[PDB]
Amino acid sequence: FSLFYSTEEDQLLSYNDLRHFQIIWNMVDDKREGVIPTFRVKFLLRLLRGRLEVDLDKDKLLFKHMCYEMERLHNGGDVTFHDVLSMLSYRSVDIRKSLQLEELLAREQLEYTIEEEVAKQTIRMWLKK
């Protein structure tokens, strides 16, 4: 019952969010391949609505971080419909209060490295010109 029963929570991914994410994916994905390139992922992120709404001026940096995370997760390889889902689940909760010790450390290191890479690439782009 704990495993399966779901209710609208505050700091957790809910069933309504799951259904809305599936709807967005379906309106994004064409033939249910489950693998999409970076452009499809970023357009899906732009099209996310509801509780997972990402205002541009509010979380532009977060959106860029998520897009680069999707890029780096497979060295530019296409996601498997769960990498996006796993990323959304991770970014929609409190990592410190939820994950286990080793998993929390690994996730924090990975997110910090991704943020540093994004900042370095942004600086390189802004300084090359």
Binding site: L3, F4, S6, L13, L18, R19, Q22, I23, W25, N26, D29, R32, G34, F81, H82, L85, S86, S89
Partner: peptide
């Protein structure tokens, strides 16, 4: 739970 979730 998300491990067994599938697209519509």
């Amino acid at each position: 739970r998300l491990k067994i979730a599938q697209p519509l």
